[PDB]
Amino acid sequence: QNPIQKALLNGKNRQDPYDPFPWYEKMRKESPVYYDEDSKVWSVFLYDDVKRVISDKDFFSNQFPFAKTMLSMDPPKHTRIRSIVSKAFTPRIMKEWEPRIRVLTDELLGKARGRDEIDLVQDFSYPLPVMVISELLGVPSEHKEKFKEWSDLLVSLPKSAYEEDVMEWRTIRNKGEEDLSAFFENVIEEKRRNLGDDIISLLIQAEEDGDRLSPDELVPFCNLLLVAGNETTTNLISNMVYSILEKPGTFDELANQPDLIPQAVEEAVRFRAPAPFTSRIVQQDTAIRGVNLKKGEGVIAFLASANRDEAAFERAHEFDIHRHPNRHIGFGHGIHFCLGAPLARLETKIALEALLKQYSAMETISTEPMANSFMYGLKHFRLHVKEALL
Template identity: 65%
Template sequence: MNVLNRRQALQRALLNGKNKQDAYHPFPWYESMRKDAPVSFDEENQVWSVFLYDDVKKVIGDKEVFSSYMPQQSSSIGNSIINMDPPRHTQIRSVVNKAFTPRVMKQWEPRIQEITDELIQKFQGRSEFDLVHDFSYPLPVIVITELLGVPSEHMDQFKAWSDLLVSTPKDKSEEAEKAFLEERNKCEEELAAFFAGIIEEKRNKPAQDIISILVKAEETGEKLSGEELIPFCTLLLVAGNETTTNLISNAMYSILETPEYIR
């Protein structure tokens, strides 16, 4: 049984629901769902959503009954670790964890701080600046690009690929859906080919970046294949990009909207 609590599905449900006029304040809708429909099937997206803590915990923890595998997912992200069950999920996670140990992340801290300072320096002294354009948009893609070991000249293309992979059709028409799928499929093909080239370079000349660590990592004598590395790299690009931009931007928005909490 596949049970998902997908952000985009919930967003669409919220926008189509009784709180459509106040999508930026979804909490009353979530409260009503917890009370009136704690387990709900979304016909449009063909997914189940669960809203109560105990139910979510059971879905996540009971691997004998619930599965992360979604057979309809054929995208690069869909083929990544988030769409796997044990034991393969456990094996890949064990390898991937080698690239994200506290020691490895600590080594990156000075460089991330340096990138942050450089971006802030660019708008120091200005009376106005665009937080998203000047800071929260470029920061995560620069960091992820360097973490993965991707040459900096590819940063803009990286960002374009990432944004497209998390986008949705411009409307619900069949034409818009078809155009969107064609564009996303092309994006995934280009990104897969790009990562395949980078991975091959790292196999021949490893460095201290995340892809090099993953290429060299072994768990019980088994290396990650290119077919497994590419989806993970794509996942890392997307998951760490948009989410960080939104976190920084929304955090600042919340602070400015509630000045009484500023100390």
């Protein structure tokens, strides 16, 4: 009964979970502005139209009939909520974490030492972002396995459009949401008279010291930062290593000149971002490519398709660490531009620097994709590895 969910189940989610890209190409070329008659929802595939839908707030609203987070809010309230944490997520504040993120990354590859096969996701790309986001928020990272279980549910989709699968899915997801929410409620209660140098303390101060934040928006805020904080960066690390190993010689280029890694992270955000789409609702009649959109019509904006648009990028289908002019919209565009982009850039850089120093070779054995998800990425990534001579 969620039209956006139905539209994903009718389109995106009918494609290979780790290879939606031929489908995006087909839509770009044949139906770049597509009405799903079943769901009553538009999809846009081309760079200029996706970029406009996500940024043109005069016409495209974030607020539908996580619901109580900045993600689902329009100005003026959006500006006040985002400003609570805007300063805390700046490149310069996240730079203070580079030492701690290096240590966490080191410790994980430490524990992998002496193994000829690793599960990148279980051993590395899941634990590091869950641990960093736990320490930033101010919760114990010893809960990472439960955090991962809850996060995977909160970004999941039913296995099909079939009412029984949707109901089964609603039950399990709702239970995840209840238990994660109870968790944060317990954390808040504890932190109110034991504040830390941490983001949950910042939120509590905003709710307690004035009316910047409602009591019913603390736990939503926690859920959003916990879940985004790991589901995005986990899948961006995994997807980036996969992108590198897919293109022979890329591994050795980056290892031989690690100053390229920041560019290669931007290329991984263009090429295999963890967030392939976002959604808007039309709040004012408009047109894209002469197609008329009416107030109240939902729109899915395929960032992943925009970032592969032949019209916007040369060799858009190629992973090119040397992309000189890359103006990807993989973090979004305009007022909802990813709050975590600096953290994500910093974690992914450090993750990849570590892997390229630790391993002189890595080869894919198997993967299990994130199927039935809002996210694009890997549940498992088994690799044969050879540790470098030091």
